[PDB]
Amino acid sequence: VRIEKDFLGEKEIPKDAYYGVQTIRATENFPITGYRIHPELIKSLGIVKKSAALANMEVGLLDKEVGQYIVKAADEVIEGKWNDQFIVDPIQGGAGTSINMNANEVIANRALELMGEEKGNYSKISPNSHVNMSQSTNDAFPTATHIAVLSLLNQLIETTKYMQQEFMKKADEFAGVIKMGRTHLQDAVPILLGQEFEAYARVIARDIERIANTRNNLYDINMGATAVGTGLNADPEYISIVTEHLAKFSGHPLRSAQHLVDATQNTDCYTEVSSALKVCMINMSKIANDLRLMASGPRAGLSEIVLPARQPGSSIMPGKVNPVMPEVMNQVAFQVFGNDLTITSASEAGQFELNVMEPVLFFNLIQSISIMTNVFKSFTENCLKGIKANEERMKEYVEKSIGIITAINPHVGYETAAKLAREAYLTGESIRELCIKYGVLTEEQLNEILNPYEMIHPGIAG
Amino acid sequence: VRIEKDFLGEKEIPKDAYYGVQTIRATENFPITGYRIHPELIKSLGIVKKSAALANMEVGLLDKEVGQYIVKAADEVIEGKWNDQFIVDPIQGGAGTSINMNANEVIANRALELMGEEKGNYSKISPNSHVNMSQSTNDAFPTATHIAVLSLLNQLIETTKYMQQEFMKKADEFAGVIKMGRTHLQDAVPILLGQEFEAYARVIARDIERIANTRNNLYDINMGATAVGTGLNADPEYISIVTEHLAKFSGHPLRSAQHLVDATQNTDCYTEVSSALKVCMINMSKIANDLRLMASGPRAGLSEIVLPARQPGSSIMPGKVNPVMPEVMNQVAFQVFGNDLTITSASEAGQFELNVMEPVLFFNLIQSISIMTNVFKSFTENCLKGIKANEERMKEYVEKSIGIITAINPHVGYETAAKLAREAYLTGESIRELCIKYGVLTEEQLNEILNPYEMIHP
Amino acid sequence: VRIEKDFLGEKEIPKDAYYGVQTIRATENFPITGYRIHPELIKSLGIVKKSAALANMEVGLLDKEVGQYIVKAADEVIEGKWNDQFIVDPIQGGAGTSINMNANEVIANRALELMGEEKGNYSKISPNSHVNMSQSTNDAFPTATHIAVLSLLNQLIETTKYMQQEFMKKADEFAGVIKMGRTHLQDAVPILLGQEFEAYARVIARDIERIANTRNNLYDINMGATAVGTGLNADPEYISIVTEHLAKFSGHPLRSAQHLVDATQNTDCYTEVSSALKVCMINMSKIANDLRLMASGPRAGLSEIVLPARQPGSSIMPGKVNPVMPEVMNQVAFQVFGNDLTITSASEAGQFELNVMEPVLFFNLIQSISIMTNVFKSFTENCLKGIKANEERMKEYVEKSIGIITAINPHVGYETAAKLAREAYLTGESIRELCIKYGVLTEEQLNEILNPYEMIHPG
Amino acid sequence: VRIEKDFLGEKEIPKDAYYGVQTIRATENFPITGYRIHPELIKSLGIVKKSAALANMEVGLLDKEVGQYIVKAADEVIEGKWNDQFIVDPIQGGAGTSINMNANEVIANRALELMGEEKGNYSKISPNSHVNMSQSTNDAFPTATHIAVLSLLNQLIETTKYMQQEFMKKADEFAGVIKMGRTHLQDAVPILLGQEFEAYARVIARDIERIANTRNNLYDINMGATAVGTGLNADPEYISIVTEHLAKFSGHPLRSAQHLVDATQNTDCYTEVSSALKVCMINMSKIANDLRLMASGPRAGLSEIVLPARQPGSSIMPGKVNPVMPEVMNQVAFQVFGNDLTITSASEAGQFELNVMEPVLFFNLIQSISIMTNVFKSFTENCLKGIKANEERMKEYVEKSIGIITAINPHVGYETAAKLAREAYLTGESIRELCIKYGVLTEEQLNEILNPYEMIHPGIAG
Ligand SMILES: N[C@@H](CC(=O)O)C(=O)O
């Protein structure tokens, strides 16, 4: 063990620990969810602390001898070698101070270990004085979050792109598959299954566009703002140097916000992302709702498509296969919706120079990106690639519908077309049967008029 | 045209009008929605103003000669005679102050007209000094709201009880109608259409209970609170008497809240009501969603039930009958959900002694109650009562299903039961026909195992 | 008092009414809010019908003698001459069918009267056969809504730009007004009032940017899609013409969507507009919360700014000036939040080829735009432009604060700073006086260090 | 390593693991959040499994040799020996089948071990045939949830009660502490600080009542419903016995639902709970907001109250004391708001005989209860108990206010009071001074009129 003194007393800390009293105190204050910060935030925090230490040495404010061990220690953090050391709740008071301090202590303590000194020897390397030099909670924390969110978003985009491409392949596969379109859930007129799947592919391409556009406002960073955005006693050179580093290491084209009070007190950039992610899930949920309807059956549903069986569906009926993959998509949607409200509430709660509610906001926005990425990947691997169409059954729906009379009409004139439809609806005979029965059209004439393609695309009938 | 002057200058009030300059300024400040306060709120404002006058006269604060006409004028407001004079926007700043003054001005000017004086002569009858005597915005305004919400709630309750009884009628009507149950939208085991409709009746019964129970907290009013809850300078007798009058004239069992500061600054009683409304609409929405699935077709859908046609259809497209009635239920549900968020955000916005965000809160609360009352009524009279079942289509689903097999499962044993299940998926044939030819159970045993009452009860 | 027979029986339509039984039926079916659709939507419906009449005539589908009057009648609808005649509820089932038919019936009957026949003679001019020719509910309705939203949106942008400029004018006005920054509602370091205001103007600048970019997806219309987006029996030339007519008479650069089925069944374009509106109101509500705090008092509060009085206050309680304008701002913000959830649930509700929940979504979308426009306008003219500062008050928050030691810190070393702050917090003595007390800095140097600009900019 | 089997194929499974093929499949299908279901749900599933086994033996449906061991294995789940073994994501497709099978497999495998048989040997103890006998996912899963929710709800109520009473103590401690009331954030008339705190106590007490009242509907369980609520094949003796065991081991007054179809397909009882949780956090958030304002300062805020410091401040900023405890309450409030929307959305998506969105729902409902319990406890312990009043500073606010003229008014007549009020406002002088300077009341007369109690309570002037 080891001891450290705080304004609240002393704490017995395990020797193997790299956190200190501040982190433990945050543990006592906020035992809220029992979760830890997402590893991408940890890696981002490492980047910030590596960038600050580096920039600080260059302008001679941090001693070159101790700064090198801070850098080396930050790199290990960036590698994810110290994730277990980050113990503070993502839902916490103090506006991210504990998260920042958690990084500061773990970085100072590894830096100390690497130069043969002892953990807790803060007179030599200080979590506050060296590791946190030139920076405030209110710049280090948000900056880390922009990096983390950006990195996570790029991922989402790649995975959403792959899913959208796979939606496009099914449209090609189903390009010629004819079915009944439905409106109000009531039979309408012929549609192609491939047109429904292209419709899914296009809304997603659009989702990809909106999500990507939200990265721009995240690129503006507030490093060098000090407490309130005024940059009081900040060195303009530290600023331009630390941003240049942060951009390189993170691999994002970060820019230093033009007005740092603006970048320090406003949280619109975050609500922008959530909104785009919400719109996306809305569309995904709807698509998932269609897939579950098309897979309904096997006998008292619609049975248009077959989903790859992904686990036994019933614990007392060995047979039936539920659409579990689309089901989990729906549940992620409802999650993202709920997260969006929490983010909306947190953003509006900002006061004067700081929004103290960012911890809960950042936990929800990170959660949404991650869980969307996750279901997206899983759903495309385990469902979307293997979806198969029941072409024969969907064809039978077409031959038996009243809707085909819409393609037949212009060839037969309005009066008789309506009498054929009325007769077919009431007797349960197909329109074809009646057209041939009353000698109104031939078997050959109807075969050309009921062409799957001409029925589902514009064009003058004659 | 007449002249009233203001700390912002002169405004001309049309001679036909009973509002004064204060109300006009409200208009210019808050031209937000173009809507006007609910007629039930107007009545309630009247009740509040009449109860107040009567108390102030009894306790000798209001001159008996002027108060007599104030009461008379307030009574006309209660009676709906002056609805068009209430012109301020339900979405407004000033924490309802404009609403209060709108009632005050109208009642002042009508009282003056009644005693042969000139409208606008606030020397003789003042909107603040008389009509608002012993009152604050912060008691009169929430008190009328409590009264109005309560009255609207009781009307919702009666409408919902009626609707619930019409569901339970349909449950009895479909008591013996067998159909295939669906979980995950995947065929399960048989169920009775009447059983689903009982499920509906029962969930609604629970909604009625939840809704009615939210009334109790509204019965506590803050009349007499003055600005914050302290009641500075108020007569304890004025408080005692005005509460009595408020209950008598409103027909609600109102109670003077036990801690006036609590009643003046907290707004939990409205969120409690909105929550119960929201829960009800969730259930309603789910039910409407089902209704629309059951009516889907007539060839490429489930076609289990028929809903009365409420659209003119198409003469080219017979059989297409859109479920417009459940559709409107869904959209009301979606509004209520939204209304509830607005109510929540407005409630959390309270600060110290007053929650000034009440004007938007109340407008949304009132909207919710009102719009559910209206769909509940229209849905009931134009859809629910007339729903018919397609018995053959449904019976046909049972006979041609695999699910039928868990019902004749320990009559043949598990031996040739998986032979009867792994072949019934293969051949695409019914299980009734695979029992009369194999010989494991003959016609007479299949006759009662597949009874519309046998396989749907433990 | 005319008579019209419905598949449900005879209804008596008033002498001077231009609607018909179909509209009346919607009235019976859906007496939900007692509201009417927005006039811009009425105007946009008229544009849809006028464009359709012109295309149908050119393409040879509509008789030109009859069509000539349909156009005339539609123009009157556009000029807003028949807003009274649009009586259906914006919360309605049937996926906008009755809104469409309300337009169809009004235009038919007014066309009839223009050509001197009796209203209701739908053998001559049919709401269905003529006024709704080559159209479905499922393309005419959305296209009207797209045009209506876009017009309203352009007003909102114009209004928001104005408000944003007035914020920027206030930032320049206050550019030299020193005050104490607060984080966690706790005294922090000094900040200019002008800087806070610049932060309001820039967030609104971004809101405008966001809101404006949402117009693009709305430009893609589905006119010609017919029932499901297949365009079954549709003449491509009709589709092509009607689109170009819609762009011209609406003022928007409308384009025929690339995939009509997609355009017919997806609703992402509306939630996109909603989301951007919601984000704007979050920022506006936050700003109004600050204004209300800044104006608190006048004795037991922050009392940093004076808002123009807008509510009459009592002679007996002067000083009490309630910030009603930011208050209304806050409530429109709350309104928009809930509208946005309604919009989300409506959109998620879509099934297969059509989302039937659009009326409640469109009602909500239009409300949001409409109430934002009106509250921005009133707030700008009745609060923002007339804001004043209490310079002296804020100036002495700074002088009397501990926070100011941050500006002094690197000039006197960290250790002396902490000794000075400690005495400051103990005795109440100003940090300025303490430095002179101990001769650690001269009056000269305090004037250079505690300079308003010097404390609030990098260095 | 080991090899297992189900209706879809084979999987490899670690030898030390107690879960099986069906669980491991779910981990592949739903790698969504990386969270695990709540301890209390694991406990409750054990109660379901133990009760059903006991009921199956007494009916002569389950072999007593094998059944004896299932019970013993189930008790160890109840004691929490095997939590590490429940690995399925709380956000999952299949409507809880995975959570149900996770328990079924863990219990079967441990039951085998106990009787000296091999793990995975389902020929001897089947997770489907033995452990899940007579029950479905669609009763076992929601029944374990009702029980779990009830036990967490009882704990919350208890903690909330404790909090409320601490607020009541504060109200008493501050009963005579005079301050200025504010409406619109503008100065109004005097109020007692304790009158405010009492108003906080009373809204919480109503919250307790609401939350507690949501329990009634959760007492009705659907055990014996099989797949759809029809109790197909299920034996009336079993239902009666199992219902009786569930109540005894759960400690709750559980009842068999009157209409099992209703209880199987309806979800109102969960949204009812969520709603009560939301209303509460609305109130809690407001109180927190008032607290953070009251704590504002120390020189440019309101400085009405002092919160126990829970955060080390720098020696450069003494007196800056961030209200970290109320801040976390606010963020928990926003979390709960979001969770309620997720819950509304999931409950709405029910279809026919089952709502398959229960997993995301249940996860958010358990999250809301738990995180409220946790902040409530921490907040009272690390903030509420230690709040002190700035009596002096608040008295000064009262004396320098304009609103005291409302008390003085009746003793003076309207017009003299008005004049004094206006002159006090414009000159910045105290109403008290102007009263003497002009001789409208004496020093002693004013001390009578400005009595802290008589100003903040109803009563005629004289
Ligand atoms: N959730 C399954 C039942 C089960 O797994 O026991 C179904 O309803 O299909």
Ligand SMILES: [Ca+2]
């Ligand atoms: Ca029938």
Ligand SMILES: [Ca+2]
């Ligand atoms: Ca000035």
